[PDB]
Assembly symmetry: C3
C-alpha cells in the first residue's frame, strides 16, 4: 500500500468517498465525481506536464480554451467558466475550419461559456483581422455545419485591445455564431476596439432563436481606417436584440456606425439605449443573403429604444441579384425616443428618423418596401441642423404609414432635388402626427414636406401645424416633375393665416380627377352693384379645380357681407352669393379654405 501515493496522485480525489450531507439515501460517490460536475479554464490551462500556467499578458490562452471547448463537446456539452479575477489573453489564430474566418476560438454545439473574468486580445492582433469566437466549422459557410445550443453569458468582459484596423478591407468580429440555432449572448461587455461587428447571429438566413440581451458595447470604432460598423448583425430569423446598451465616443463612429442590422424575418430590436452612433438600425432584405430563410424580410420590430445618433435612426432597404429579389414588408417602428446629437448642419450623414435608402450600389429603382407602420415615436433635432427629416425618402417606396408620432426637426418628408426620383405609393401621413416648433424661423427657402419625387399615388398627407413658422416657403410642395394621383393632401388652417404659400403644386397637379385637397389661400373678390342678395367673383381665374371654398376671415363691414361659401365657374373664377344691405360694387381680399372633393 501506498494509499498515500494514490491520494497524492491526480486520481486521489477518485478515492476519497462522499455522500451528500451524510444522507444514507444518497449516492455513494467520490470527491472527484462531484468536482467533475463543473469545469473551468483552469482544468485545461496547463503545460504538457500538467502544471497549471498563470494567465497574463505574456501567456497565449487560446490553445487551452480550445482544448476545454473541444473536450466538453465530446461529452455532449456543458458550461465552461472563464474565471473571475483574471485576465485571459488571446495571442494567436485558431486552426482548421475557422482559419478562413480569421477565427481565434471555435465554438461547439452545447458548449456554453460562462465568462466571469476578462478576455483580452494581445498585440499579435494589432493591425490584423480577427473574429474572436467563430461557430462555423468550415472556411466556406455554405459547407459549414451548424452551431446549436451555445450560450455566452456572465459579468465578464471581451476587450479588443484598442487596436486599429490595418486596412479598410479587413473584417473584425467578437462573436460570429455561424449557422446558429438557439445561441445567445447575455450580460457581456464588449469594449475597446475598432471592429466591423461585435456579434453576428446566423449566416444568410440559416439559424434560428438567437438573441443578444443585457449586453454592453462600448467604444468599438476608433479609426478612419474602419470601413463600416454594425454592432449586432441579425442574419437569422426568430432572433433579436433586447435591453442592450451601445455607446461610441469617436468622431468616426458618428459617420460609419450602426447599432443593429436586422436582415431576416421575425426579428426584433427592443428596449435598448444608443449613444454616439451614426445609425440606429438597418431593416433590410438583401437578395445576396436570402439563402436560408427566403426572399422576404417580414415581422421586423424596432420598439421602445432610446437613441442619440448623428445620422439616421431606422434605415429601410431591399434589393435584387441576378437571380433573387428581396422584399421588405410587415415592419413596426414604435415607442422609440430618438434625437440627433449636437452637431453642425451637414457634418454627418443626413439626419432622419426613417430613411428609405438606395441599395449599396446606389440604385433607387429596385426596392420593394411596404406595409410599414411608424407609430408613437418621438424625434428631435436641434434647430441648426438643416439636414434633419422625419423621413428621407430617397428610393422607391411601396408603402409606409405614420400615425401618432411627434417629429420635431427641419423637414417632415424630404428628398434632395436633382438626385434620385423615387416612385412613391401608399405614403400615409395621418393628421395625428404632431409637428414641433424647434425649427420655427429657420426654414427660409424650404418646404416642410418637400415632395421631390417622380410620382406619388395612393398617398395621404394631412399637415397640421402646432405653432407658426412664417419662414418656410410652403407647408408642402410638389414640383411639376412629380405626378400626383389618387391622393389626399390637406393643410389645416391653424397657424397658417399669414403664410403666402401653404400648399404648392408647381404643375397644377391638384386638378387631377382623383386628387382630394384642401388648403388656405388669399383671394381677391369683386361683387356686382345690386342691392340685396349679390354675387361676388374672384378676380383671378386659377380656381377651375375648386369644388367649394369657405371664409377664414372676419367681415369688417356693416353695409354688406361677402359669401360665407363659394363654388366655381368654368372660367376658373370662384363665385358665391353675399348680401348688399346698400347697393354698390364691393371689392374684398379674403382668406379662404380652398377645397377639392373634400
Amino acid at each position: 500500500d501506498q494509499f498515500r501515493a494514490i491520494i497524492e496522485s491526480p486520481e486521489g480525489a477518485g478515492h476519497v468517498g462522499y455522500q451528500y450531507r451524510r444522507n444514507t439515501g444518497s449516492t455513494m460517490r467520490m470527491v472527484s465525481d462531484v468536482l467533475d460536475e463543473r469545469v473551468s479554464l483552469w482544468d485545461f490551462h496547463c503545460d504538457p506536464s500538467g502544471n497549471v500556467i498563470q494567465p497574463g499578458p505574456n501567456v497565449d490562452s487560446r490553445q487551452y480554451l480550445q482544448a476545454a471547448i473541444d473536450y466538453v463537446s465530446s461529452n455532449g456539452g456543458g458550461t465552461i467558466t472563464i474565471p473571475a479575477g483574471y485576465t485571459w489573453y488571446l495571442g494567436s489564430y485558431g486552426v482548421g475550419g475557422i482559419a478562413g474566418h480569421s477565427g481565434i476560438i471555435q465554438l461547439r454545439s452545447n458548449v456554453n461559456l460562462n465568462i466571469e473574468g476578462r478576455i483580452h486580445l494581445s498585440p499579435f492582433f494589432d493591425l490584423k483581422p480577427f473574429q474572436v469566437f467563430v461557430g462555423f466549422d468550415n472556411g466556406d459557410p455554405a459547407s459549414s455545419g451548424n452551431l446549436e445550443n451555445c450560450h455566452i453569458y456572465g459579468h465578464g468582459v471581451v476587450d479588443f485591445g484598442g487596436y486599429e484596423f490595418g486596412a479598410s478591407s479587413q473584417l473584425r468580429n467578437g462573436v460570429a455564431f455561424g449557422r446558429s440555432y438557439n445561441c445567445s449572448v447575455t450580460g457581456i461587455t464588449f469594449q475597446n476596439g475598432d471592429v466591423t461587428w461585435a456579434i453576428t447571429l446566423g449566416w444568410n438566413g440559416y439559424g434560428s432563436n438567437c438573441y443578444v440581451r443585457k449586453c454592453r458595447f462600448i467604444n468599438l470604432v476608433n479609426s478612419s481606417v474602419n470601413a463600416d460598423h454594425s454592432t449586432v448583425y441579425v442574419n437569422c430569423p426568430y432572433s433579436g436584440v433586447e435591453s442592450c446598451y451601445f455607446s461610441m465616443s469617436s468622431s468616426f463612429a458618428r459617420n460609419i456606425a450602426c447599432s443593429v442590422q436586422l436582415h431576416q424575418h421575425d426579428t426584433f430590436y427592443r428596449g435598448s439605449t444608443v449613444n454616439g452612433y451614426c445609425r440606429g438600425a438597418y431593416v433590410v432584405m438583401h437578395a445576396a443573403e436570402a439563402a436560408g430563410a427566403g426572399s422576404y424580410a417580414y415581422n421586423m420590430q424596432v420598439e421602445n429604444n432610446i437613441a442619440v445618433i448623428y445620422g439616421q435612426f431606422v434605415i429601410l432597404g431591399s434589393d435584387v441579384t441576378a437571380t433573387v429579389s428581396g422584399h421588405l414588408n410587415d415592419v413596426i417602428v414604435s415607442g422609440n425616443i430618438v434625437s440627433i446629437g449636437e452637431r453642425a448642419a451637414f457634418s454627418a450623414p443626413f439626419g432622419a428618423f426613417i430613411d428609405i435608402g438606395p441599395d449599396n450600389s446606389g440604385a433607387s429603382n429596385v426596392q420593394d418596401i411596404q406595409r410599414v407602420l411608424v407609430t408613437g415615436n418621438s424625434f428631435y433635432a436641434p434647430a441648426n441642423i438643416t439636414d434633419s427629416a422625419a423621413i428621407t425618402l430617397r428610393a422607391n417606396l411601396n408603402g409606409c404609414t405614420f400615425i401618432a408620432n411627434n417629429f420635431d426637426c427641419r423637414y417632415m418628408v424630404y428628398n434632395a432635388p436633382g438626385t434620385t426620383s423615387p416612385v412613391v405609393q401608399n405614403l400615409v401621413w395621418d393628421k395625428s402626427n404632431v409637428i414641433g416648433g424647434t425649427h420655427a424661423n429657420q426654414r427660409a427657402g424650404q418646404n416642410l414636406f418637400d415632395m421631390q419625387f417622380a410620382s406619388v399615388v395612393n398617398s395621404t398627407i394631412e399637415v397640421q401645424l402646432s405653432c407658426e413658422d412664417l419662414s418656410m416657403f410652403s407647408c408642402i410642395l410638389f414640383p411639376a416633375s412629380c405626378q400626383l394621383s389618387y391622393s389626399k393632401i390637406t393643410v389645416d388652417s391653424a397657424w397658417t393665416k399669414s403664410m403666402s404659400n401653404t400648399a404648392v403644386f408647381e404643375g397644377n397637379q391638384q386638378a387631377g380627377a382623383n386628387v382630394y385637397v384642401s388648403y388656405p389661400a388669399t383671394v381677391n373678390l369683386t361683387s356686382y352693384n345690386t342691392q340685396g342678395a349679390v354675387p361676388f367673383f374672384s378676380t383671378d381665374t386659377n380656381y377651375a379645380w375648386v369644388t367649394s371654398a369657405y371664409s377664414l376671415s372676419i367681415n369688417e363691414n356693416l353695409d354688406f357681407s361677402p359669401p360665407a361659401t363659394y363654388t366655381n365657374k368654368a372660367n376658373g373664377q370662384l363665385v358665391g352669393v353675399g348680401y348688399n344691405e346698400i347697393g354698390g360694387v364691393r371689392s374684398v381680399s379674403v382668406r379662404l379654405m380652398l377645397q377639392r372633393q373634400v
Copy 2:
C-alpha cells in the same frame, strides 16, 4: 487506525480539511462541507446499495428526482441541477397528492430545478395523460396547500416524446405549478408533444408573481385527437409571460392552438414571437375560475408581440355561473405586429385581430367587457382571405376603443348575419386607424364595416380610406334590425367619389335625434328660372334628416353656379341658393357631403 478505511468510505470527504484559498481568517472546514453547498440529480440517482445508475432510455429517473426534491425541501430549500450532457427519462407516474393530476414529479416550495440536460418522456406515457411537474399537494386543488418560491431554469429541455393523446378527454401539461406564489420558468425549451398546455400558473385565481420568460415552446400539438391547446395558462394575478418563442408546424395547431391565456387581473403577455398557431391570447374572466382573486379581470396587457396566426390574435370574453358573474375591463393591446398566414379563405377559424367571443356554451348575452384600448398595432391578412377582420364582434360588448392602428384585411368591423345579435355600447373607432388596401377589388357584395348587431349606442365610427376600393358594396352598413342611437358615424370623402354607396342605413337610422353622421352622396337638383340669386332643390325627398350639405363637385358651367351649401325643407328636399348669370331652369347632378348635426 484505518484512517484509510475512513478516507475511502462515504464519510471520507468529511475528514479531509479545507480552508478557502489558504486564508488563515477563513473557516476551517472539510471537503464534504463545500461539496454539500451544491446538489445534483447524481446525488440521488442510485440503487439501494448507493451505486450510481446511468440514465437512459431504459432507466426510469422519476423516483430519484423525487427523492432529491423531497430531501432538499426538508432542509428549507435550494437548487437541484439536472446535469448537462445527459438525457434523463421519466417512465412511471408519481404517487400521493399528484396522482389525481396524472402527475410525474411533485414540486416543493423553495426547491428550484436548474435543468441543464434533457428530460424526456418514455413510451410508458404514449396515449396516456400526464403532467410532468405538479405543484399541488392534493388530488383536489381546493384542498391543496401552496407552492412557493419554486423556479425552473436553465438551458435544458423538456421533451414530450412525440406521443399523441389517446383520447380527446385527456389532459397533458409540462409544468402545473398549482396554487403558486413566486414561481417561474426561465430559459427552458419545451418540445415534441401533443399536450393541452406547456405551463399553467396558479389555480382559479390562487397564486401571485408567477412568470414565464425566455422559454421556447416548439411543436406541442401533433394530432386530430388533441381537443384544445393553450401553451401558457396564467391563472393567478400579478403574473405573466415575456420574451418567449412559440412555434407549431402541424395542421391541427392552426385550428386549435393558442399561445397564451390570461385569466386573472394584473397579467401580461409581452415581447414574444408566435408562429403556426390558431390564436395569440385569450383575455377572459371565467366565472368558474374566480375563487382566489375575485370576479374581475382588470389590468390585462398584450404588448409588443410578433405573430403569424391562422385564426384570431386576441380573444376577449367573460361569463357567469349560477352564483358568480365575471367581468373584463381595463385591457390594453398595443405594439403588436400580427398577420394571418397564407391559407385558403374559411380553412381555419375566422381571422381577426380582436374577437369578442361567445362563452364556451356559445352564449352572447352574458359578457361584461369594457374599457379596452387597442392602439398602435399592425394587422395584415393576404388578399384572398375573405374571413379576416380587425374585429369580429360576436357577443355583447360594453366598450372597446381603437386608436392609431393599421388594419389591412377584408373587414374592419364584422359579425355574421343570421348568427348572434350583439348589444354594442361604446365602440370607438378613431379616425387615426389606417385602413389598408391589400383587399381592394376583392369586396364585391361586402360591407367594410358590417354592423350586424341588435343595437349600437354611444359609439364612434370614423371611416377614412387611404386608397380606392370600388368593389365594396358600402363603407358601412347598418341593417334595419340594428338600432342606432347616441352615436357618431362619418365617412371621409377621400377615395369615395365614384362609390354608389358610402354609408347605408337600411332602417333610416341616421334620422335619429342623437345620431351625428356625415357621408358623400350623389344628388340631382333642379333650379327655378329666375335670373340672379336662385334656389336649387333636390328632386328626391329623402333628406329630412340632413342639417347641412356642401358640394364635392366642380361646376363645369359659365352661365350659372349651383349652391356651394344646402340645408333642408320639411318635405325632405335639400335647398340652397345658387346664382343664374342668365336665367333658365337648371338641372345638375352633384356629389355632396351630407351632414347631420356635424
Copy 3:
C-alpha cells in the same frame, strides 16, 4: 510522516490530487484548487478559532459577510453566495466610510453577491436609520471613490424586519450603490419594512449602466412616521428599472409612496406592475443633483407599465439652485395602463395621469419642462373620484404633447383656481385622445378642460366626446385672467347638441388675432320680409370674431329655409342668405358651428 495529520488539517485538500474527468490532457490539480473556484459566506462565518458558526436570530452575521467581501475584493473580485436554506441576520452597523451612511455592509467593486437565502435585520435596528448595503467608501459622497461591476442577484430575500422608523428625519435604504458604474440588482425580493428607498443607483449624476430587473418590492412603508418613499431611485444616467413588481398594503403608502424616481438622462422605467402606491414615477431634473451628468434630464422613458395608484402616475419637475438651473426635455410616456384605486374623493393626493408639479418649496415659476410625448396610454378613475385628471398642470410648462391616449376620469386638463397661475406653452391635445364616459352625469359645476392658468400660447386643444355628459358646465373654459394667443381650440359637435355651454372664454379671448377656434352654439335669427333669396341676421351682437358658421339643425319648415352658412358683420351680428318661398319675416333658433379662422 503524518500524511494523516496533513490530510486532516486545513491544508488537507491541497494534498489530494485531481484531474478533471480523468482526462490525461487536463491540469493536475488538488481538490482545494477546484473548491477555491467558488466562495460562500460559510468560508468566513466562523469564530476566531476557525469553527463555523450557525446563523440565526441571535447571531450577528455582519462581520463575517464583510470579511468575505473584503477578501474577494483583494483578489480582483468574484461572486459570494449567501446560501439557500438559511436566514442570515444583520445586527450591528458597519465601520469606516459607510458609517456616515448608517451603513451595514460595504460593497466593493467586482464583488458580486448571489443571495439565495434570506438576509434579515435584527431588532438592534428597530426605530433606527440603516442602509443595508452601501457602495460609497467615504462619509461624504463628494469624496467617495466609485463602485464598479457589482451585481446582487438570486432568488433570495432582503427582509427589513417590519420595524417602523423612529423619527421622520431618519433615512433607510436596502441597496445604496453610491457612485455606481455597471452595477445591478436582479431577482431579489425586498420586503417587510418602513424605508425611504429599497435601491438607489448612482449619486447626483455620478454613475452609469445601473439596473434593477425582475425584483419584487413588497410592503416597504408601514408607519405614519415615514416622511417619504420612492422604491427605486435612479440617480445616474444610462440606467433603469424593468420587469419589477411593486406592492404596498398600508394606508400610509397611498399617501407618500412612489415606485420609481428617474433623476438623470437616458433612464427608463418599463414593463413593471405597481399596486397600492401613491405615485408611479417622478421624472425630474433637480438642480441640487446635477453634478455628475449635467443640468439636463433628457431621454426619459416610462413605458408599458401596469399600475393601480392613489395619487399621480407620472410627475414631471425641474428646478434651480443659486448656481444651477435644471431642465427636463425629451420624455416619452407610452403603453401604460393605470387606474386610481377605489377611494373616496380627496382622500389621497389628487389623482392624475400626468402631474406638472411645483418644486419641493412649492415654486411654480422655475420649471423648464418641454418636448414630452404622452401616447397610447390608458387611464381610468372610478366615477366618485372628483380629484382625477388626465393632467394636473400646476406649474409652468414649456411643452407637453398628448396623442392617442384613452383618458377616463373626471377632468382632462385641470389646475385649481385660486392656487398657482402657470404659464403654459406648447400644450398639444390631439383629437385622437379618447375621452371616456365613466364620469358622465357627475360633472355639475365642472369644466372638463379647466384652463386655470396665467396664460396659454402655442397650444392645441381638440375636444372630442364619445358620449353625452350634460352635467358638465362646459367642455372647456378659460377664465378672464388667462391670456390665450396663437392657439387652436376646437369642440367637435358629436354629443354636444343639448349643451348650453361648449367652449367658454370668460374674457372673450377667442377674439384674438391668432386664435383659431370652432364650437357649437345656439343662435336666434330673424329674416327680412322679402320673397326669394333673403337675409337672416342674428339677434345678438356677440359674433364679431366669427369668420364663418354653419347649421347643425334641421329645418322643420316648408315655406322657407334659413342659410346653411353664415358670415359676420362689423356690429357683431351673423348674416347669411336663406330663401323665402313665400314672403314673411322669419324667426328661428338654430344650432350652429361657430368658426374662427378654421
